[PDB]
């Protein structure tokens, strides 16, 4: 049954991810914080406002604000408020965020090497398409 | 969390699945038995051996044999060994199985109408393949 197998896959997938994130020592960075840290490190000539994080992660301001607040508490970023507009805040990688970023690139590189073996990109775009239309149908 | 979200979706899909199988009274047919019944009902001029079932459902003789024995226990088919060949066993849709067929057709129509809207069958076949190969890769 496809639904029973998918339920099984999800559980294996969460276990598989926790195990690698530990092996690569990016366990707390795995997930949205990693996605933010990555974008920062990949685009050094741009600035990231908290609103940049909302649009990339399609989350709300309250959710994004507590996310960047978490990343600052973890020593991953410096939050620097804009001097012109008091409501705009910028995100900057610390030294630890830079090291963690570059380690996170390596961890993802192996995941795309292992988990997506034998899966073309056209198969992936459609799979994401099917899952979204199932979700919309619910 | 994307994984938390996928788990919730699959749980919604299964709940909606049970809802339609109850509605159309086809709960045991969701899956291979329904596929066999359909092949029987749709092709009434051919005969289906157990070895035919292996090819149709891409299963083993042992898996097909336990499948049809389950379908007979549910009264969907009669398994009648060949009167010519002692090694061939044939499958025949019963009266109950013919009613289940048309009940199963409307059920599939409802799935394609509601939960599986906008998803072609080729899109489903790839989705199943990605799921099989991702599971293989975490091993």
Residue numbers in the entry:
A (entry chain B): 3 to 140
B (entry chain A): 3 to 141
Please give the exact wording used by the authors of the publication that reports this structure:
Recombinant PefR was purified in its apo form. Gel filtration analyses showed that apo-PefR eluted as a single peak with an estimated molecular mass of ~35 kDa, indicating that PefR (ca. 17 kDa in monomer) exists as a homodimer in solution. We observed structural distortions by the N-terminal His tag by comparing the X-ray crystal structures of apo-PefR with and without the N-terminal His tag.
